[model samples]
Target chain A: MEAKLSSIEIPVGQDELSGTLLTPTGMPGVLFVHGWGGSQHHSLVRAREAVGLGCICMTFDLRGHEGYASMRQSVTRAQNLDDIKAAYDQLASLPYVDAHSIAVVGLSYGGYLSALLTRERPVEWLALRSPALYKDAHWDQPKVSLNADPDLMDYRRRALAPGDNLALAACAQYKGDVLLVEAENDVIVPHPVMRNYADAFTNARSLTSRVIAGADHALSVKEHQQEYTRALIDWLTEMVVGR
Target chain B: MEAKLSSIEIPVGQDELSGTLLTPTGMPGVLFVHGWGGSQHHSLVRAREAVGLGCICMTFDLRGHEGYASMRQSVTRAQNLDDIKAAYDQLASLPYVDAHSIAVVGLSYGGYLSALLTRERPVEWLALRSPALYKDAHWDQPKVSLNADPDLMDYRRRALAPGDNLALAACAQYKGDVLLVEAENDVIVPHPVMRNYADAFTNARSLTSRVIAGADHALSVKEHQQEYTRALIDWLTEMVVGR
Candidate 1:
């Protein structure tokens, strides 16, 4: 039988985050964070895989996506990050959830959020795909699409250009298990940019990474997408369940 | 300047095709056909570029996509082809449109429809992005996502395997201008499959093809999409406008 998919609306301050939960009782939990201009629907296929592997999966649409776009003004980066926190809290709150076995998987912008979220949360396992480093303190109205730069040293402090500014202080201290999946031909988060992220993991207990050949930032095709899901499932099984 | 998008609805049998038109006046008309499970919104970005180059452009949701999915059963491939013809007819009927100078651009499944349409319509300039040659005579119920197979033969007929199908037959006879845009990293439409398409256009007066490196079937990222738009615009300008 397929896992039961439950529609959820998580309460975050005055805003409610719309999401879906794929469940079975007393399983390891996984929280999926989508990229910018993406929604909870992005995680459905992967959620199915996770569910089949005995995982409790949660996927949600962040601010500026789905029903959230109805809000007159877009939320700041701070607000979006908080939404991530809200989703993490919701997943952790489940009575059957194994608190110490929680794994967070994120894509692109969501990967960036996951990186920041790890520092604050007790997440034991983390996986990132094409994550960007945001140096911005508050991602003002309608977040800008910042290009990756080589000279940009301090992702957490220094602003490189007109739009590149989200902090990168968290990854340096998080001594957890990490999986960094890099898209081979990604122009958005190119090789150098990906290296910066890898270098930031100073004390990671295990930093396993792979480069998906001929894949772009979007991993646009079915094979590439399938590869990503398989990678996540395999890594989670090893890092969380194998332990 | 921003292109003016006009919302339109075209009647087809009992159902209606929802569309958007971007026009200036008295210019070459181009119709945009989206892939299966996609909507009119998918072609808006390319339409903007076409409009900027002084072309009358139209994009519409196919029968099974967007709000039109509520119609009890999915339309047949023949019915889908009819929808393409109807759309072409609509563009030709526009007072400010240049009927003889009409061009059609399609992506994936939509590219298949465009191929069928060309056999019956007088399309002057034709372009396809990762178009597939389906052997199915008619897609009767809800369409299924059929993965591309190198060894599997005949989606319907025996001789139709390895790209020898309706699309090829149409291209063989289409002696006018043609542009075939292939995604370099595409697994759905691989190199051998693309070669089948290239070989089929043997008798064309002029056949131009491009391979967008690191691009997927959908050209998922902004930069790759921009590259596609630029390629289409440049080719259309040379073929239709320069002519």
Candidate 2:
């Protein structure tokens, strides 16, 4: 006896079929930049988690850190900003990375540099934790020399407008999603610095802000570190995967 | 008012912490080759599905097809084989593609070329649908000229050993996972051809064989087309994502 087999019907030569079969090329690119003294170590943890969300993740040391630590005293803000631009370019240029869907995650000084990076590159998402603030007066001065400035701490304490700072200026014009994180007990980049950064993202499509309870500027405690990671991964999961 | 927030416990500074933080870099690459008389159109559908599974996929026309149709009579099997190699190399070289994890999907003639490709390059997964069989005597002969060989159909009907066929020989040595699909009513590449290919995969980690009920060589029926897509996507899901 011959048996009849049931088959599923798939429309042929239809316009909608072509749309359904439309192959997506390139995954989102996530670039991580560590803080001033930190190497790529801290960001490596977050980068790993981002990769699990089907992103192409990259974490590299800034010019004044890790392998380039010898140049810490001589590396300027301009040089570090160039480093971020170069890393972003490399990550975006990969054949399997969607250049238009790049996410840049930075910590402290790296966050300051990342804000500047938005002006130089196409960043779809920007995340900053304890992003530092500096006066626009010494653009090319060595980064370490900036710390020696008599008014450095007071400068960060002021709630300057977007037009008064370069990073804030970039944030003022940014049109992408933003995630701003702060350490509850941060002394290096106090609450005033975080407030200024939050106030600058007037054009951002979305902004999410969080504070790690009892955490220092460097996220020194284990619980604080885990909280920051959770906040970051949660925000990224929404921005990258959920969308 | 002050509030204490409870935090999730994440192990800190342990040897295992480093392992948890290890970031994954590149993604699997999938390269598709269409059969003779076909362009990259057919492969594009499957390529799109593979991409959804987190694979970087590429589909292109052979030198003698589509844009190069004028060379149909002059293009040799050797040239087409080179086409496969070039495509494989380009796909593997992408910064976001893990060179060691590559899957080659082919139909008929392309499947024959893909088999030869594994010998020239590293292929971790191989999927072939109605892979055609040919004689090794005319290795450099024009592809169209092979169709004129009146004995070709007879040659395919007879089961040949791997020692006598180039593609079968490559299959004999392949150590990767293989998915070989056959059409029940396929006259071009009949049952004997599928049997020969199945027998040649002596060292494959796994071999999955499927027959499309009442299907022809080209899968002209819409149901058959959908069935093939389902079979291919299912096999890929198991071999790629499930692992």
Candidate 3:
């Protein structure tokens, strides 16, 4: 059994984004994205985890990040969503990928992008771990934020960035079976915030959310880390692999 | 796809050894070995490395290590070899692995046994990274000498043992293509040691040696880590899949 590596430049609208592909033993592929200011480097750990599960994990710096200097910076969230779609397009063109079994997974900002993907792409299954959706976001867990004025309540669609509420709104659009993992100790993206979206999704029918005890934003704690990987395996096995 | 973690007590000769399996989404499975004194826990990174590449990577505790306190007390290096054989047997029986395409990869002390596995089994290919098999049996680098007894050789076999000169002699027995990867700055398993194996095996018609610059025994150094993974993919590409 052998693994492979390839360098790729994906077309994002007019500009291009850089990414790397790691194909282990040549299984189907997994495309990954990172949160704010994070790039393909931060996603290596996730790629390594996916590779452990016999997946050829592909990761890239998303739209607004490093190495894509020519592209104009994105201020509106819509630009980020388009960048993610471009990344997916990059993966779809690869000859080796099964394509049929492609899975979209994300964390924090990546998680928000994944939610958008589910609506747009209709994945076989979806797992959101500590997603950063929501309009009433936490400063610690920025689902959304309020106006500095505090008295600005007469709202429209653009009210105060919509925090957890905006993200929750998107969750309702997801049509796939969902597994939302919540990290109770997460300061950047709280478990309660994730649960709120889990609550808002289409049918609680196929949706299940678990609270990892004392888990931080990244689920890097030893106990929670173990639990996170385990649960991921379980979900992939039952929902994705048909095991 | 979903990755499952299942553990069962493997009856290896007298005592039972624990085995953890991460079945991937492909044919052809790989057996993974942990670094010294590490059980299955330490094996995750390497295992994940394999799984992401599409090969089901199994990591388990050898006898008396980690939590596997099987027999009354200590187990010898020979027993560790036996543990590796059990893993091979388990892998050989799996429906996923081609059985013919079964591969074994080991590092450091584990690499020593993985190479030794070549002698007695039906291995498709062997990837030996910073393997301890050397020109002489009782050989140890100057630094990291927990055991100073120079003559008290550990695992007195052909590769890196006391009396046997296999720098070229032992590789002749490898029935399949051999991959020899050594760290650039590996003092413990010196570069010459890997070179010795490579020089011995290079003309064998099926051998290749790769040097990952700046990598130590663990392949942890950031500089050559990509080289380590890429070289593996290339080597495995040439040896296993290319065939």
Candidate 4:
């Protein structure tokens, strides 16, 4: 029996966030986050893919997405950390979800957000492929490194904004299963930022990281993405069974 | 072939609305608009049903839908109408869509907005089912209509201060075929209002109204809803066979 993905409202600060949950017929749940300017539907294909892997996945728009019809479209750095705390509280509130069994999957901007989310919640199992952030210096600067013309590049935010990193550092205190995934051909996130982020979590004995070939920033190539998905599911199985 | 719906960043007044084109394969396009608190993906099941019936369809979340997370969510009477007009423009702009052959099927809130959209654009055909504001009298006194205690009702402004019968009047004034269908058990939209709307289209020759028995606003009941869909396809066949 395939589980259904439908809308649910969650309180996010003064506003609310719209979300969808996939219950995986009958199994534990995963709270999934979408990319920058992405709602639940953008990660839907992967959520559906996870369903086949025997996991219930939750996907929804960000704070400003249309599906949730929330009051705000964008948030400040402090607001995002606040959102992560709220998301954690809400996910734990769901009856179907196993709070300890969650494996956070973030794509592109979502991947970076997940890292930030971990700052507060510190999921037992964390998986990220291409997190669209700026690291190795030069993020908040007026000039961007990845683009010939910084004007053409939009999603350049501090890879670990001092405020955001402070929260993430607190989350790094969590000693649980963590994995960092990366793609080589990623245009936006590229490999450097992801590698640095992955290396940052070298504390956990079970920590793992991988860089896929030919996969873009978003893993836009569907077939190639299966490797990423397979890696995630494998870790989830290890966490559930091996743990 | 399973048709793909394209997402575009389009404008409706001040906001950028999300749009998608649904082609049913061989038939003239149906520029479908969704109901309140609904997005383009919300009406997917209905479009799939129509696709099964051999029609090319275009479906989209008007302004604030999840898959269409181009911007923030805003739910106002004005925003809803803007979505209808914006989406109509998007569908009309499509190359595959027959400029004169495209029809609009408004579902519930979509039905309400479609009335306005058709009046504004006067498409080749108009199909409205379970439209809100079909009977203005019922909605005029929201407290009484909703069976809410007087104290519980919000009197700050009209809960939904909808305008006059401008769209219905426009529908009557337009020349192409106009069809109004409703479910007998639709509690959200009463029969009296549906009838009133039908009557407003005084020219019976160009307008046809039908009621489906044992079906509610969602048309979830199997037997009656099937008949309703069949009747719609038959009418659509008659309406588009020549064009």
Candidate 5:
């Protein structure tokens, strides 16, 4: 069998987001969303995992990230949600995809956006790895890299809206299979934070949850990374393929 | 989590085989062999499938196929077996591999070679996709493309030995799980021929088999291709991941 690669530009608002699609021709589709301080490049491995399971995969850089320079100055959290919807709509429209069977796999901020997107889209499967949830309106500036200064959050908050508690909205609207991959030693996205996000998916049809014993926020350790991938893929195959 | 891709080279008798390894750190390993008239590129989808399962994957060109041309003049079937072994040994030696949990996946002619490789190596899983077999000494000339003349097979017989009914020998020796993906509508290596190969796996501890409805030898149709990929990935996950 031959897998194919295609580059796409998703129009969001007045700007366009760049993305790549890896397809095993006609199959279920998966949309990959990278985290805060990350780009579409970070999602390639997971996207390829979808392709391995014979799914059409879409990965794109959110506004102010990767090659999308028009909005490089600043992007609001609501804008990020709309951009994610743009990516989702573009993926769902593909002829190769079973539109209703589309799944979203996200990490950190991507997971945050996925939660919001699920409220509006008819996604059947949702897999989140260390989904980030801020306790309050305090949030970091969204960009290709993190802003190191503590005071910057105060300055950024003036321009960014935290958006209606994303996990809450998604849990209230979406009913689907959900897989939560939590990192045990993650300091950035703490256990309480991830579990909090998990607790909100009250309407989920089926929830499969796991925590990697020694993994951090990034799953930087090779063993931790493999374990994370295995859990996601195994659960996805069962969810989408029913095996 | 990130999947890593690395360029690889396997040294055979007098030539080196070029390949690529797609790994997700430490996990079970899979060796992919392209069929006759096929290159390593043909196995990309399958390799990525293994990677999705958190398995290390290696796909390489055989002696006279793809870019390795040192022995292009007249590479023997025995030499091909050695090249396959070379690739397998290189994959098993990787630190991330469990060594004992390695599997071999081959298509058509590569499937035949995989059978022979398993006879000598401790392969834990075997997945064959439309494996090609010859009834007797009559065989097609090994090259980048198929030969049209019967004269070529007669002359090549002096150097090439098709390994004396490989399915028979492998089935007699290998007691691991086996997955045989047969193409239902294949005209080239039809059902009878595939069943002949299946019949030889008398001692296989577990044999899981499926046929793609209306699929040809190459599974060129989009629907058939997707079905074939699903069966292969689903069965592989069960055999290697036990899910």
Candidate 6:
């Protein structure tokens, strides 16, 4: 039976022999919020990759989507924003997660809500892909009703300041690293909306902005989706490991 | 400003698009216990390697060693065993750790105590390096006093059954994966002691035993130490990832 076992080589050398056991606590947490009409399925791939970097990751569908699709017209922006807060709080409360080292990655409407989330929670890193712009007039109104406003499209085309939008106000106050992604040919969220978000991140520690060439708001092309994945993973690696 | 940033490639293809976010709650926990006279420093490197596998690792000094060197002569095996229990309990209590997926690694006297710990606590994986054996007669006596016994050397040389030794009894009851490592020419823990341990792990789910060529009890040679590191890392990878 002993002959069946494999033998390992013992290497000889005088090498540096210093090491410290890393504590289980203080590991960074990553939260993913999908776009409107998208489920947590969209972010699961990214969340899995983040786990390989020793991060505690979470990806969840917001209310009015997936299991709650029946309530789409009744769920207000406040309720959906509360969903993000609930996810953040749950991830932060884990004993091994460092509440101060949280990264939130969101797309489109989810990105807009994630920006607003910073004002209510502690977020260390923020990544937004075609973050949508909305008016501040519909605080208690249903999220779907916002699309009926005739001025919403014109509002997204304008270069808004921090005071002009709630999401921009949250971005202005954020002091963490930021990754802003834009779609070159996005009609839903145009270049001006991306610029407005970038301009609002004035207090960010470091800002990295990227554009997916010839991509649409939905990233309809598989290649464009892959580009977004690569960018997000690379940014996370820099923030979590390189830092 | 966008010109300075690097562009990532967007791969094209219809590939399998399926993924699920891993829950942080079920990550395995690994605990390391150093030899009788050794400090936690020896296990730090191994602990660090284990962390790369997404395991929550811990390394701590035994009560009778390091800061409590003054109590080495007075410390009882019973008390030292309690220290191992405490470490296991603390690691298992962490919310992110899977209490059912724990691996305990130990060297020499620490290995002996770790074996005894299995009978008292839940240990899913056990790794022992040159595990030292003590007589059951010294149950309540000081640990150091057991060394002065005239028949101690004779006891180690004999082939003991699980019914005759506390550590062996624990091994007999264990139904988890076991990694039993031995020094090729360790005078303190001779071949018979190694055989006694291997024979006692009758109920193990899997048994992998390795011998460090031309190594002594202390593994004073750098090459021998490197071999031990390789074996341990390989075993941990198999148990954690491959499983």
Task: State every prediction's TM-score relative to the real structure.
Answer: 0.42, 0.63, 0.42, 0.39, 0.45, 0.61
lDDT (0 to 1) per candidate: 0.69, 0.80, 0.58, 0.57, 0.68, 0.81
Model 5 TM-score? 0.45
Quote the positional error of residue A53 for candidate 2 in Å: 5.9
lDDT of 3 by residue, A1-243 (tens): 344444333232232322222334334456666676666665454555665554555666654455542232322356556666666655555555555556666777778777777667646566777766433333332112223334322321222222336556656766667777878877666544555565678553388677898778876778887787677667765654551
Q: Can you list each candidate's DockQ?
A: 0.01, 0.06, 0.04, 0.01, 0.03, 0.10
lDDT minimum window of 10 residues, candidate 2 chain A: A1-10
Whichever of 3 and 4 has more DockQ, that candidate is 3
Candidate 3: tens digits of C-alpha lDDT, residues B1-243: 334333333232232322232334335666666556655555454555664445555666655554445421445555666677776776666555567777777777777767667777877777888876432443323212423445324332224321255324556566677777888877677765665566555434476678776677666766576787777766655555553
Native contacts recovered, in order, as a fraction for each? 0.00, 0.10, 0.07, 0.00, 0.00, 0.20
lDDT of 2 by residue, B53-172 (tens): 766677777776766787789888888887777677767886657898899999999999999899889999999999998888888889888889999989989988899898999999
Residues A71-162, model 1: lDDT tens digits: 32545666677777877776777665767767888888789889889878988888999887655543554454333344333442333332
| Fnat measured on candidate 2 | 0.10
User: Which residue pairs collide in model 6, if any?
Assistant: none
CAPRI grade, predicted model 6? incorrect
Tens-place lDDT per residue, model 5, A112-209, is 77887787898899988887654334334544233444543443223222234646566656689898898898766776665566667777898889
**What is the per-residue lDDT of model 6 for residues B1-243, given as tens digits with 9 covering 90 to 100?**
000111111111221111133444567888888887887778767787777666777777676675667778897887777777767777788676789889999998899999999887888899999999998886879988988897889999999999999889999999999999999999999999999999999999999999998899999999999899899989998998854
* Model 6 lDDT per residue over A1-243, tens place: 000111111111221111123454567888888888998777767777787666777777677776567768887888878778877877788676789899999899999999999989999999999998889997999988999898888998988999988999999999999999999999899999999989899999999999999999888899998999999999999998854
Residues A1-243, candidate 4: write the lDDT tens digits.
223344443332233334332222224456666665566566555555454343455654454456434534334334444444555555555554566666777776567667767656747777766765533233333212224456424434224433344324533554666777777776677655654465466555577777777887667788667788777777776665553
Pick out the ten consecutive residues of candidate 6 chain A with the lowest summed lDDT.
Answer: A1-10
**If chain B of candidate 4 is superposed on the true chain B, what is its TM-score?**
0.69
Q: Residue B172 lDDT in model 4?
A: 62
Best by lDDT: 6
Chain B TM, every candidate: 0.80, 0.89, 0.70, 0.69, 0.77, 0.89
